[PDB]
Scaffold this active site. Sequence first.
Site, PDB file in Angstrom:
ATOM      1  N   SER A   1      46.650  72.295  53.178  1.00 36.45           N
ATOM      2  CA  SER A   1      45.500  71.665  53.810  1.00 36.45           C
ATOM      3  C   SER A   1      44.905  70.653  52.839  1.00 36.45           C
ATOM      4  O   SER A   1      44.799  70.924  51.645  1.00 36.45           O
ATOM      5  CB  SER A   1      44.466  72.736  54.157  1.00 36.45           C
ATOM      6  OG  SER A   1      43.428  72.206  54.951  1.00 36.45           O
TER       7      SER A   1
ATOM      8  N   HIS B   1      42.582  63.581  56.398  1.00 38.45           N
ATOM      9  CA  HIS B   1      42.852  65.017  56.395  1.00 38.45           C
ATOM     10  C   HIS B   1      44.233  65.296  56.977  1.00 38.45           C
ATOM     11  O   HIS B   1      44.704  64.580  57.863  1.00 38.45           O
ATOM     12  CB  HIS B   1      41.767  65.750  57.199  1.00 38.45           C
ATOM     13  CG  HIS B   1      42.199  67.069  57.765  1.00 38.45           C
ATOM     14  ND1 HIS B   1      42.652  67.211  59.060  1.00 38.45           N
ATOM     15  CD2 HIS B   1      42.235  68.307  57.216  1.00 38.45           C
ATOM     16  CE1 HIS B   1      42.941  68.480  59.286  1.00 38.45           C
ATOM     17  NE2 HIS B   1      42.696  69.168  58.183  1.00 38.45           N
TER      18      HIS B   1
ATOM     19  N   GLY C   1      36.345  86.225  55.073  1.00 34.45           N
ATOM     20  CA  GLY C   1      36.295  86.367  53.622  1.00 34.45           C
ATOM     21  C   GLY C   1      37.502  85.776  52.913  1.00 34.45           C
ATOM     22  O   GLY C   1      38.078  86.407  52.028  1.00 34.45           O
ATOM     23  N   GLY C   2      37.894  84.568  53.318  1.00 39.39           N
ATOM     24  CA  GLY C   2      38.870  83.775  52.568  1.00 39.39           C
ATOM     25  C   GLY C   2      38.206  83.171  51.338  1.00 39.39           C
ATOM     26  O   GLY C   2      37.018  83.381  51.107  1.00 39.39           O
ATOM     27  N   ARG C   3      38.959  82.408  50.549  1.00 31.80           N
ATOM     28  CA  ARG C   3      38.427  81.859  49.298  1.00 31.80           C
ATOM     29  C   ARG C   3      37.542  80.628  49.548  1.00 31.80           C
ATOM     30  O   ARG C   3      38.032  79.533  49.814  1.00 31.80           O
ATOM     31  CB  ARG C   3      39.554  81.554  48.309  1.00 31.80           C
ATOM     32  CG  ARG C   3      39.083  81.602  46.866  1.00 31.80           C
ATOM     33  CD  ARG C   3      40.226  81.595  45.901  1.00 31.80           C
ATOM     34  NE  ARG C   3      39.786  81.267  44.545  1.00 31.80           N
ATOM     35  CZ  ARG C   3      39.507  80.037  44.105  1.00 31.80           C
ATOM     36  NH1 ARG C   3      39.601  78.978  44.907  1.00 31.80           N
ATOM     37  NH2 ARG C   3      39.118  79.863  42.848  1.00 31.80           N
TER      38      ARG C   3
ATOM     39  N   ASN D   1      47.230  68.802  57.619  1.00 28.54           N
ATOM     40  CA  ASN D   1      47.519  70.220  57.605  1.00 28.54           C
ATOM     41  C   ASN D   1      48.970  70.411  58.043  1.00 28.54           C
ATOM     42  O   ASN D   1      49.454  69.698  58.926  1.00 28.54           O
ATOM     43  CB  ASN D   1      46.545  70.955  58.541  1.00 28.54           C
ATOM     44  CG  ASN D   1      46.488  72.477  58.294  1.00 28.54           C
ATOM     45  OD1 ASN D   1      47.398  73.216  58.655  1.00 28.54           O
ATOM     46  ND2 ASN D   1      45.391  72.938  57.707  1.00 28.54           N
ATOM     47  N   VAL D   2      49.676  71.314  57.364  1.00 26.48           N
ATOM     48  CA  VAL D   2      50.949  71.858  57.840  1.00 26.48           C
ATOM     49  C   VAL D   2      50.956  73.348  57.489  1.00 26.48           C
ATOM     50  O   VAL D   2      50.725  73.730  56.340  1.00 26.48           O
ATOM     51  CB  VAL D   2      52.200  71.147  57.238  1.00 26.48           C
ATOM     52  CG1 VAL D   2      52.417  69.790  57.894  1.00 26.48           C
ATOM     53  CG2 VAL D   2      52.075  70.985  55.744  1.00 26.48           C
ATOM     54  N   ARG D   3      51.201  74.175  58.495  1.00 22.68           N
ATOM     55  CA  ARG D   3      51.054  75.610  58.379  1.00 22.68           C
ATOM     56  C   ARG D   3      52.051  76.310  59.288  1.00 22.68           C
ATOM     57  O   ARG D   3      52.384  75.809  60.368  1.00 22.68           O
ATOM     58  CB  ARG D   3      49.629  76.022  58.768  1.00 22.68           C
ATOM     59  CG  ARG D   3      49.142  75.409  60.082  1.00 22.68           C
ATOM     60  CD  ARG D   3      47.658  75.692  60.372  1.00 22.68           C
ATOM     61  NE  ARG D   3      47.027  74.589  61.119  1.00 22.68           N
ATOM     62  CZ  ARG D   3      46.953  74.496  62.446  1.00 22.68           C
ATOM     63  NH1 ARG D   3      47.460  75.445  63.225  1.00 22.68           N
ATOM     64  NH2 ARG D   3      46.357  73.440  63.008  1.00 22.68           N
TER      65      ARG D   3
END
Lengths: 292, 291
Positions: free
Chosen positions: A84, A98, A250-252, A100-102
């Site tokens: 990201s 921006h 609760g990700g970083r 994203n590749v996921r």
Amino acid sequence: MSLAIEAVKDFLVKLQDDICEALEAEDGQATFMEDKWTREGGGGGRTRVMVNGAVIEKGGVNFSHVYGKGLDMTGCNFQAMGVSLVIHPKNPHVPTSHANVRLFVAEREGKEPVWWFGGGFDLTPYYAVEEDCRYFHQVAQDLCKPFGADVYTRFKVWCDEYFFIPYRNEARGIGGLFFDDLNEWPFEKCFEFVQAVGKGYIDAYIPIVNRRKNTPYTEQQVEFQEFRRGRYAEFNLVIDRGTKFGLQSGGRTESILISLPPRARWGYDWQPEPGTPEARLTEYFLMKRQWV
Amino acid sequence: MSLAIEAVKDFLVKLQDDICEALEAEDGQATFMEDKWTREGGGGGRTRVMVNGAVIEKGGVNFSHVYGKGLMTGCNFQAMGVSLVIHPKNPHVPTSHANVRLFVAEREGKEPVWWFGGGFDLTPYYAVEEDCRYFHQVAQDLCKPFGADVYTRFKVWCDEYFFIPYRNEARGIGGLFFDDLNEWPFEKCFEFVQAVGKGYIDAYIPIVNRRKNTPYTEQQVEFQEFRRGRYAEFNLVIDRGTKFGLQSGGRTESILISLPPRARWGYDWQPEPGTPEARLTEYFLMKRQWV
């Protein structure tokens, strides 16, 4: 499909490297600083960030492998890996962008793995240039050509529909590509498609940085840039699904909020001055939704 | 109910005039600008804002009274309230917020469902011990006659609501918060909100007066601005009224008066250790015990 996942991880790691190197070269001055982290009982990530460059004031290019057991799949072993990025240049005449590749994989007992890809890229101008908006979309259209006649149109539209602030009736930028739940083609064609998308971002965005980075600018233009950046923060914090999931699960936090601008302005009913190049961003550029 | 519900309305109209006049008196230079608006469906409000005064850089004190058909399924409704957010120029004066409101849903045959909600809270940047406890003592004092567990319940609620969970961080030093208040008779709940509305003026105005003339520097303005990213985050990511308003067709600019005039964000930004800046999150926001 553990070997497929390893192949995908390796791609993302290399994509992150190539995107950082490309931006470093184009910046000339700053370098990306690496932050490797882990999460208890899950995987972790690699967050690379650039600050105070001669071009890029605040850039982030993050890799993450998120894990966990439990998201009919309800308690299924879920897995997500992706890259990201958000780049916020100093010079308002260079657009924010921006990408994203996921990949997402969910595994159950007595089932074949369910997998899908997601991602895209998009441009967020402040002082837009006609030639750049269509160029950006042309790159996107070209990379889609090998994969189907409907692919640019479908994902170009999706990009317009998703990056929209319904309560201001206003697009976030001039679009590009956006897709999710991609598994309609065999895995390998899907993987090639996100490979093309990642390559596309560099082919699309870097030339635009090169063309515009030395456009002279005033403090007035910086001020407008900062009010436009309030709109960016609003979308990411109120609307964007990935940011919303990341924060609520609760990700970083700091890895998730690299997206946010280095500074933003808000004012009561703030509106660009009418009949200016400032007004033409929202009156024309964010409104045309037709570039190729 | 109608004349009781109208008394509440009349109180909220007066409360806005009173708060706005108190804030103008503290500033001295700048005055509130009114934007009267109507809602498609019934009712509307008055949004007053102040920009670039000697003391208040961005202020907003809204009143609304919205009503209409359908949401208590397909009930006629009335919603009225005053909400405010004040962001001072001087970092040494805290940001503050307050809200008092009533919701009424009438039913053919049956009595109406109604409740009140509201409170007030203080968001310092360069907090001072005696101001944090003055703020809470006003809170505790106004609560006292209403019952032995009113200040504690609503002070604890305030801490629980104004909390950024993904950052493990309170928005500020707290105050009072409540919603769904109908456990007492209407008259008493009503008197409670009037005590809360007035409480904000007694609690906040003297603090503005004490700190407005404190010398500040561009570096403290920088800190103020990084801290205002935390404020924008809570309102945009967590706040219920904001989320709801933006999603369901609220008036955007009236809802987003809460946002700071300027905010900053930096990757893993933290104040320098061992400084008055660090002491905000290390001490003041962690104490949660001021009376």
